[PDB]
Amino acid sequence: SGFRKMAFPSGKVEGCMVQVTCGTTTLNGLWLDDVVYCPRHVICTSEDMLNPNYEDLLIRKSNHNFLVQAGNVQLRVIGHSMQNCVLKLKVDTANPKTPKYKFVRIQPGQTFSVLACYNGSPSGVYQCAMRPNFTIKGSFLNGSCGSVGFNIDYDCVSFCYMHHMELPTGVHAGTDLEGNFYGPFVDRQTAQAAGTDTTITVNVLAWLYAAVINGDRWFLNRFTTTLNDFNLVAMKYNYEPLTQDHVDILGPLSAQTGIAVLDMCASLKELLQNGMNGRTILGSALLEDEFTPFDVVRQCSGVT
């Protein structure tokens, strides 16, 4: 029993983190096989960030200008290329610690672990989610760029995020490992405002199921609702619309607890309208939305 915001074990990813320096800037790179992936803004000066022409700036860079260090040993760069907003630095040595891996592009609502790094060295690990506005709420200081987000499926690491930017509002933006930004964000120091950060309804429901499984049941009520009625309330509270696909995804949790998905929706509807009244659910005074249904089943079943 108990339910925590749990990250995946970070060891497999720690074995891939390297330091990348271009000129005076140092950030992190991800070393998989004989390729080091990093944000292309490593080539920029602070002046360049205002309106960078990355193809033009990259012409002035050679393999020997990209300093890649793995621990205290230098890697030899034998090629470089730009793929969207990431650089791929080909090195002469395959990472001996390369885990089984995949590059995946996640959807909003999906969670992942982040291994925050500075100078190619891991500082900490935390869990977050791709927000519906395509930002993430991370913990990143200067030097953290190139830190990655991932999920693990037994022994395969699915990398889904690489950190690139902090917006003026303190929220974060980045790319998948193909270098495509999530959402409309760009790697430029310009006015980029995020859209509405709606709540991930299917994840809140999953977390209410985790609460019931772990003994917190005070919020269960005598009501039910329909998807359409629930969605009228969800729209009012800036919650994402619940679809029949979400109801199907919640099936295993509904079966485990014996609480029909629409009955849990009615409990969530009352919590939205009535508030918590100073009470807590799984140690939280707000409705938590950064656990997917898969995360809840995984944590409640002890998948390793």
Added chain:
Amino acid sequence: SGFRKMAFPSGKVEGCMVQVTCGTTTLNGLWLDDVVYCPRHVICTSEDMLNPNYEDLLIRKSNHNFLVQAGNVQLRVIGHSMQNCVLKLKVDTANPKTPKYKFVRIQPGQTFSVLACYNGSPSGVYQCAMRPNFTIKGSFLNGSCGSVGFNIDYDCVSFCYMHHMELPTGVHAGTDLEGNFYGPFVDRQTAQAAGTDTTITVNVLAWLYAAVINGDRWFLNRFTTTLNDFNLVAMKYNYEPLTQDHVDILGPLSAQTGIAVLDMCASLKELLQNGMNGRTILGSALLEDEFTPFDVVRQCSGVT
């Protein structure tokens, strides 16, 4: 910017986790040098747990009854001994992945990372704290015993906790790596109720300083207080008394923000008396107490 409940990178500890089986029970062990540490209740049947005589039960066990597996390879047990509530299984092979380590006994209020494991395999990592009632609020299923709590200081892992028990109220109890339980708990299936789970005041203050550093400033007010006046309010709200030692520990955060510790105490006093009014601080609707002052400085400075 941003502030997350961050755990230490778990790789160094993943390299130490093994499976320990005695009879029909399988739990986790911690392999450091040529010793595997695990809960002594691995020798118990479910009937034994009601009133176990561990010295007597251990007489019936030989080295060959303790099956220790590291990954898919078996370790040879050449000795066994009981130290308080842990067993130390001497193996014929030193763990080649043994990090620099220490065994420390933490005080209530101190935080640590837990690497939840099942069958010697890591499932996830999360952050928690030694509660003032000597319980921890973890996420542990059957099979998780022997999972450990730790802190890292650059390359030295300080192990502080080994998981042993879940109380009937869903909270957790365990030992340090010398086998001494935190608090009054015992490794017996008996009536063990926890005391008051008071809030760790110095940690709440540290987290309010993290909120100011990360831009959440709405709770700052025009007031100040004294330690004695603040403590009258803290006692009323089941908060731990704040001492001058806590004020001294908060010095670096006070210097960073320019907010005197007693002024922050006055902000905390108003939040306790007035509530949050539906507002949030660092994405929380309650006052968070599982970040120590050291955690706040570490996260806000990017220590690796």
